[PDB]
Design a protein around this ligand. Structure first.
Ligand SMILES: CNc1cc(N2CCC3(CC2)CN(c2ccc(CN4CCC(C)(C)CC4)cc2)C(=O)N3)ncn1
Ligand SMILES: [Mg+2]
Lengths: 243, 198
């Protein structure tokens, strides 16, 4: 469908189709979810070690300059200087949104810097079924037209597909597909889940969201910690709650 | 010589300097993760750098090789400037490490030198195509590469029979003999291998 995209403007992925009942697991995740907590903070200027306890899952969505190639951008210089390893649990996971440029390399440097190894590369494949004749300006270094973003998965220490197909968001909208949360939550990796650089629009049960653009906070380190005091400490997120 | 050429050999031991310069190198190496694999050192020491001065490298990577291939790519003198993914479907156009099921294959794109005269921006970094045979790369990449670099000299490493393509010299051990037609190349091959045996 590549001689077709060059002809009609439809990206090869505009033609993938369909884009048993695993429903009970979803019920278990939902019953298990902590209430949402959130905290406005400027992450540049904030000691991350105050975020406690240590996290089972970190979802990290820094605002790359490339997200605003049409309309405070963080550089990979800035991202790399975060001390993620200070808030990661000894056995824990990271999901890092890397964009489609240097980030696919600088994001792997970050993963290694913080003590993870990449075991999954998740691709957000963006269709243009509603604007075929809208070819985008290219990175100077780009050979091809970039129609996807990558989200790198990292593990440290000891069902689904590695693709997300949705339609390209309207220019200036930076939201990532909410399906990233389903993939994450279906792994059953722990209940202490942190989204850095989330927004009001991303707040979600079972998640602690920290980000400079939040409008309200309800963070309390002690209240948050109580959700995981025994006998709730080592639950996966996908099990019956303890009576 | 537009028509397909190939050289059955061990790429570890063939002298690739005979082959000249190319505008595009493509390799689908057997990474060490059903056939003979090269260790990481054998891969780093491949003589990619003599193959190009100004041009592009297409490097299939899977698993652990997404990190090693980035290493070899930098070691050989390239900067990674794109990454193609092939979404694998069936004849009904639906989708088909140990943590997720892999519905794609990755191809790093690297640049070297100052390649000039290339129509960059004509294709997507997503290929969609039916999975032909197990461990077969999809024909659409050749078209993509042809649109990028029309009529230039190209070389594939670790090709299999069906990989032979016009404007392409394929190297690989599952090939049949030595089919060479470009006069400058049949010349350097006879000067470097008088008795025709690597
Ligand atoms: C000892 N040194 C050598 C060796 C040598 N060959 C080595 C043996 C080969 C033929 C060439 C290689 N291969 C092979 C199989 C699978 C892959 C993985 N890939 C992932 C990307 C893809 C989906 C687009 C295609 C499949 C990649 C490759 C063979 O099945 N057979 N040629 C010269 N010297
Ligand atoms: Mg779900």
């Amino acid at each position: 469908y590549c001689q077709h995209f060059v002809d009609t403007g439809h990206r090869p992925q505009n033609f993938i189709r369909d884009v048993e009942l695993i429903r009970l697991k979803d019920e278990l995740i939902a019953k298990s979810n902590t209430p949402p907590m959130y905290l406005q903070a400027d992450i540049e200027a904030f000691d991350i070690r105050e975020l406690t306890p240590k996290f089972d899952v970190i979802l990290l969505e820094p605002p790359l300059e490339e997200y605003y190639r049409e309309t405070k951008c963080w550089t990979w210089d800035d991202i790399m200087k975060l001390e993620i390893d200070e808030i990661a649990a000894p056995r824990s996971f990271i999901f890092l949104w890397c964009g489609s440029g240097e980030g696919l390399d600088l994001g792997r440097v970050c993963l290694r810097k913080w003590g993870y190894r990449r075991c999954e590369d998740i691709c957000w494949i963006k269709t243009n079924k509603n604007n075929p004749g809208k070819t985008k300006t290219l990175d100077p270094k780009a050979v091809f037209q970039r129609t996807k973003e990558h989200c790198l998965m990292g593990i440290k220490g000891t069902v689904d597909i590695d693709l997300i197909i949705t339609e390209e968001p309207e220019i200036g909208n930076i939201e990532k597909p909410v399906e990233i949360f389903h993939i994450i939550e279906h792994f059953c990796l722990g209940r202490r889940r942190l989204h850095l650089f989330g927004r009001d629009s991303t707040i979600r049960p079972g998640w602690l969201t920290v980000g400079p653009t939040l409008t309200n906070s309800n963070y309390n380190a002690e209240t948050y910690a109580s959700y995981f005091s025994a006998p709730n400490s080592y639950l996966t997120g996908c099990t019956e709650e303890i009576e | 010589l537009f028509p397909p050429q190939w050289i059955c050999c061990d790429i570890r031991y063939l002298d690739v300097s005979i082959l000249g310069k190319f505008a595009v190198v493509m390799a689908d190496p057997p990474w060490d993760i059903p056939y003979g694999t090269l260790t990481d050192d054998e891969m780093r020491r491949l003589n990619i750098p003599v193959l190009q001065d100004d041009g592009f490298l297409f490097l299939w990577v899977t698993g652990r090789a997404m990190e090693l291939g980035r290493e070899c790519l930098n070691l050989w003198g390239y900067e990674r400037v794109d990454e193609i993914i092939w979404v694998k479907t069936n004849q009904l156009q639906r989708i088909i490490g140990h943590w997720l099921n892999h519905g794609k294959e990755h191809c790093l794109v690297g640049v070297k030198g100052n390649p000039q005269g290339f129509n960059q921006g004509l294709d997507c970094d997503v290929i969609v195509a039916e999975v032909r045979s197990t461990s077969h790369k999809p024909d659409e990449i050749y078209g993509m590469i042809e649109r990028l670099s029309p009529g230039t000299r190209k070389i594939e490493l670790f090709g299999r029979p069906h990989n032979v393509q016009p404007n392409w010299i394929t190297l690989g051990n599952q090939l049949d003999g030595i089919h060479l037609l470009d006069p400058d190349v049949v010349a350097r091959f006879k000067q470097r291998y008088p008795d025709g045996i690597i």
